[PDB]
Design a protein around this ligand. Sequence first.
Ligand SMILES: Cc1cc2nc3c(=O)[nH]c(=O)nc-3n(C[C@H](O)[C@H](O)[C@H](O)COP(=O)(O)O)c2cc1C
Ligand SMILES: Cc1cc2nc3c(=O)[nH]c(=O)nc-3n(C[C@H](O)[C@H](O)[C@H](O)COP(=O)(O)O)c2cc1C
Ligand SMILES: Cc1cc2nc3c(=O)[nH]c(=O)nc-3n(C[C@H](O)[C@H](O)[C@H](O)COP(=O)(O)O)c2cc1C
Ligand SMILES: Cc1cc2nc3c(=O)[nH]c(=O)nc-3n(C[C@H](O)[C@H](O)[C@H](O)COP(=O)(O)O)c2cc1C
Ligand SMILES: O=C(O)[C@@H](O)C(F)(F)c1ccccc1
Ligand SMILES: O=C(O)[C@@H](O)C(F)(F)c1ccccc1
Ligand SMILES: O=C(O)[C@@H](O)C(F)(F)c1ccccc1
Ligand SMILES: O=C(O)[C@@H](O)C(F)(F)c1ccccc1
Lengths: 331, 331, 331, 331
Amino acid sequence: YVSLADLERAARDVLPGEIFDFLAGGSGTEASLVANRTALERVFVIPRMLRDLTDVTTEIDIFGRRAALPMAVAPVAYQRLFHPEGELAVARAARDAGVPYTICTLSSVSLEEIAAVGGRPWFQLYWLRDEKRSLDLVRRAEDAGCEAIVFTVDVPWMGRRLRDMRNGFALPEWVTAANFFAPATWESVEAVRAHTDLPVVLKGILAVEDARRAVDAGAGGIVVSNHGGRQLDGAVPGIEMLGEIVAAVSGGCEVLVDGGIRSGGDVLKATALGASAVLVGRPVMWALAAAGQDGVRQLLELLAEEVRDAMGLAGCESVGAARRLNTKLGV
Amino acid sequence: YVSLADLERAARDVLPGEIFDFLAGGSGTEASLVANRTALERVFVIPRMLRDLTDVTTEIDIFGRRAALPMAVAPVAYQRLFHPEGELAVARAARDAGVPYTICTLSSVSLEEIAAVGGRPWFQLYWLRDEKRSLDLVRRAEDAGCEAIVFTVDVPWMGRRLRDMRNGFALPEWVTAANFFAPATWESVEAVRAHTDLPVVLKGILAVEDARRAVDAGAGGIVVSNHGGRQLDGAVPGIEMLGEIVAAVSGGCEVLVDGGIRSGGDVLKATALGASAVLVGRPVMWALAAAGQDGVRQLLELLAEEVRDAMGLAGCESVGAARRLNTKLGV
Amino acid sequence: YVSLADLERAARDVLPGEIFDFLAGGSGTEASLVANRTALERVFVIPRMLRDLTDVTTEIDIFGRRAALPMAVAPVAYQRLFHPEGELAVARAARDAGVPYTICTLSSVSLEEIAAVGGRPWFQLYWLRDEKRSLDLVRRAEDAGCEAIVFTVDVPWMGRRLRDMRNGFALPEWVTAANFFAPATWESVEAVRAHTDLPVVLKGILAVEDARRAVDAGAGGIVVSNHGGRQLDGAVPGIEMLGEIVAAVSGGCEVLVDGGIRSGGDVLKATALGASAVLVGRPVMWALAAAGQDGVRQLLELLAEEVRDAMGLAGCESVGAARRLNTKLGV
Amino acid sequence: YVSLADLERAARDVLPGEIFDFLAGGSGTEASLVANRTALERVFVIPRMLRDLTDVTTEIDIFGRRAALPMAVAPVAYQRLFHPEGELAVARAARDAGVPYTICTLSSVSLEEIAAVGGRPWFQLYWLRDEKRSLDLVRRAEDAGCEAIVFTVDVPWMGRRLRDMRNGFALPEWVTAANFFAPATWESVEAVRAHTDLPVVLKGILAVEDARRAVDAGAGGIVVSNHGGRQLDGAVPGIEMLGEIVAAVSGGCEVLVDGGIRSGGDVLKATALGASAVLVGRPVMWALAAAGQDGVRQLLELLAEEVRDAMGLAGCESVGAARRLNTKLGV
Ligand SMILES: Cc1cc2nc3c(=O)[nH]c(=O)nc-3n(C[C@H](O)[C@H](O)[C@H](O)COP(=O)(O)O)c2cc1C
Ligand SMILES: Cc1cc2nc3c(=O)[nH]c(=O)nc-3n(C[C@H](O)[C@H](O)[C@H](O)COP(=O)(O)O)c2cc1C
Ligand SMILES: Cc1cc2nc3c(=O)[nH]c(=O)nc-3n(C[C@H](O)[C@H](O)[C@H](O)COP(=O)(O)O)c2cc1C
Ligand SMILES: Cc1cc2nc3c(=O)[nH]c(=O)nc-3n(C[C@H](O)[C@H](O)[C@H](O)COP(=O)(O)O)c2cc1C
Ligand SMILES: O=C(O)[C@@H](O)C(F)(F)c1ccccc1
Ligand SMILES: O=C(O)[C@@H](O)C(F)(F)c1ccccc1
Ligand SMILES: O=C(O)[C@@H](O)C(F)(F)c1ccccc1
Ligand SMILES: O=C(O)[C@@H](O)C(F)(F)c1ccccc1
């Protein structure tokens, strides 16, 4: 594989159509899904030349841990849909690559089993029916060694997935929510923040004042995101809000972004717009479907090579230097 | 049906081509018809997160009545062209859905029969040869229980419908103007305003100063509209004038918009740009052609679900909150 | 024919390919040819409503004469290429329609014969080898009753017509320059201005300061034009310079525009951007090729109907009102 | 050949696919490769009329020598890949056309042999493992009569050429680096500047402050360039940075540009944006592949004719006048 696009083909070949559609699809007309890519393709980097590249490093420190790349694996529910080893395969490859892995509330392997793999696990929280059971998942995650709580805030309910509706898609009986819902509010965030010493990261922020409020609320990070175009159809891409959000929080929390990151060059664009790190979702599942743990390993090695390549070609010996790059929007 | 686009296909299958063309077409090169859709697709919403959604309501109060959605059925002439029950089928479904229905001057069932269905009927006025007969239609409408007069102001004459001209389209003899024309001016508006206690709504306003003058003239509302691209070919889409018009009237009248609204997400966009409500035209006729009253019921249920979905995903418990959303224009 | 596009098809059918290419083509990659259309399609009009349309008139006064439309037939060389009656057919139809006709220096019928048709003939000048012979053409034109000299200023030499080069196109022996070249300068303009009492109109102005200088030089008009994309490939469309040019000359001369005008709606756009009038080139030749004098008559009747339609739908009882319309650029 | 596009076809026919791909391709997704063309196509020139064109000249003085056009042949490695005479064929044609030829560090004929052809040779430097051997190439070039050192600064390493990777492309054994690498820094530039009296030209500058620093560092010129989209995928096109760079250096060095120049009109655009001259890469190799030295001669004659044509049509008797043209960005 010489690009991430190589893996999507392989995944399309092996996966049942309705499962590929569950993975690929978005809500409504998929306007926001498409816009995530459009928006990245309009960004051009202004590279710097003639700088010292003797020790280029793609490493970052985030939420108290070194990561090998400014990247984590996005939360993706029910990974056994894509390969029999599901979350274990992905978590093992992420660990070996030095990349944080986000364990889902709706994981198809229990969070404790996935955490036992080691590495840098984060835990993604969906708010439950009750504060006490929500906080129990959080406590489980913390007890198991997860190092951040990624509280997803853009799913008061699931968006309208028309591919799933037309396919009559349902979870096969051989996939379960192995850790076993209500709309979250700012009160829910405070309940979580008070219940853990772990950094709380709010995933799904797009409005500048919600980013500001996240910092005021004690969040250690946010993910600027429209949930891969799966939630509000017509939601602005995170990448188009990122610069304004980074300016507004002025270093008060980590600012991650996701949606359509498909190469090391895309990681560089995100960094140049001010992101601390990116999440990558669908491509990690393509790699998992295509070739299991080894597939995910190959994807992460490819991404690592592309990130180093893009950084050096842009004159950046560190991710902090890449954040100081300027950009120019094209057509 | 999981989207409005499902219904257009069914309508295309059942309707005679020249009738489908009468419905689908625009004037001239159909530049304004296409631009209505382009313009909506360029609008992205910036959703808010973590707000209280315990009692999301899509209801609005407009022209003295509660409506179930920020939506009314647009005036569409000669609905028996599309189904034998014509206006009665549509009016019944609108009533049952809690949506206002606009009875046309050129209705193929008399305005009194359609009003007898109940619900929230509005009446759309085309200015006639003479002030006295124009005012008679208005008086008929008011006597029959219509609750607003939608005075169409962008048809001094009918636009050049090239599909109709190439098809040699004419009303079949089995369709008549069951209520049975000159250019309207501001004097005509005043004649109507003086003749009724009902709110007068000027449909087809695009210039900011015409919106201002509408308020000065005593209009209770305007519809920002290029008549679905059927009148001036090259007229700006209403959605591209809406924000500027809403700012200029500064609460002095209701500001509705139409043209290309095809989903609950589109309703949300219109609301976020400042609209009080939208009108929906062609899709209601697709539903009527495809499946009569039941078809229109299904369309309105779908739209209601999509509007509630979009509002909640955008953090809006009410339509007023949706009007306070920000937007960002894309490419 | 219900549109100008109807006629192009007919012309394509009847004309030898190399002659159709001579007519349709532009210079270089035809970037400017295409951009003339792109640019018009991006312009949207903001129509006014509810104005008095009791006596809508499309007439204008220009260069001392009433014209039936804000339009003239552009200079097009060698019209016998397209029909045996050539310039006589076009001039007769223009006369009957009340539209000025521009007689070319490179006409295939002598300027005196074409002037004898009557109507409102203008004369287009290409600067010759010598001042004295140039001025002789001007004097011939004036003696024959031409009412303006349209001095073409964007052809120091003919552009690179790659269609013509690939076709090995040459004038057939049955077409001649019946009135029988060096780069023109501002000195040439002054020589012409001093030699005639007729208004001198500079055709091919695109730079704002060249428009200003044209007024200073005593021009009665300019045509803002990139010569239909036939001269500099990459020249900005006239329609994209028009508003800035109209503002800069501030009523000091008539400002016409051409390039891609293909409907009455396009005439309205040009007027709303500030043009006094438009020229129309290729469509008049399509009509000539398709059906001779009668074809040109039909085209001009169609354009007249479309101009009246567009004006009234936009709330304009006169061309001066249409010049006060606002516009909004789309995508 | 009536355009540069004629030659690409011929080259595609004759060259082995993997060699055509080596020539045509870019890095990554080829976003920057495509953007070079997009960016040029969006630029429109505002031509001037009625100026004296009695002695139009396309000549410029640059780096102490007259050149026949504001153009040089870009450095392209390993030209024997495209024709058996390789660099000798191209250098001979460039000499005969009065165009500088850039001899590459990775030339497939020795720099001394190519310099012996005569003409105006420049020498392109890739920084080597060691300062002393780097400076030896520079000294060789100067001894052999090269008149500028074009130090390529955007290749700390070669970009990711996915076409080459998928083709498994490697140099055939019949092509060698006949003159026989580490990342260059500003220290390397100073080492070169101190080692030669020749002007040093930094090729691959895109950031405005790198252009400023180039002048401060004693560079005689820069080439604003993204290396033909072959280095950082997502790097902004040089043509989109050119105007800002020209303003920032304020005459302190020559500012060249390359990337996608494919006609005399493109040369005019570059000049109007402020370039001193352009480089042309791939088209020169198309001509070489198609027809050897004679092919390159034909290409340069065509470009010369197109440049003269574009300049005169734009009212420019000199390249300095063309630099004073205004432009307008289109869609
Ligand atoms: C199949 C699938 C399942 C997902 N499940 C979750 C989830 O359980 N929790 C969550 O916060 N995001 C979930 N996401 C959203 C991703 O974390 C991410 O925001 C999105 O995929 C955008 O990134 P991408 O374009 O790289 O896929 C899911 C996305 C996909 C495609
Ligand atoms: C077939 C058809 C008939 C219409 N008849 C009327 C009419 O009688 N009066 C009126 O004011 N608008 C009329 N309209 C315009 C609509 O009210 C509305 O402005 C337009 O269709 C744009 O909305 P849409 O894109 O949702 O169809 C008609 C539209 C269509 C398509
Ligand atoms: C076949 C042809 C011949 C033309 N001959 C002349 C000419 O002799 N003199 C002139 O000033 N313009 C000439 N023009 C330019 C036109 O007057 C006009 O500027 C151009 O066609 C743009 O208008 P259009 O898009 O309506 O064709 C010619 C154009 C065409 C297509
Ligand atoms: C096959 C090929 C080889 C090249 N080799 C070199 C090189 O050795 N040194 C260099 O500075 N640029 C090299 N370049 C870049 C060119 O000098 C130039 O920047 C680029 O091709 C953009 O111009 P174009 O679009 O006219 O090809 C090469 C380009 C190509 C296509
Ligand atoms: O985007 C997703 O699929 C998840 O975030 C979800 F939580 F919304 C979800 C999980 C499982 C099935 C449908 C939606
Ligand atoms: O857009 C429409 O079709 C109506 O608004 C109309 F009034 F213009 C009309 C009604 C019937 C036939 C043609 C136009
Ligand atoms: O655009 C044109 O064809 C004319 O304006 C011309 F004068 F340039 C010309 C006339 C006849 C043949 C080629 C060009
Ligand atoms: O763009 C290029 O091909 C050259 O500039 C290069 F130096 F990068 C190079 C030369 C030979 C093989 C691969 C890259």
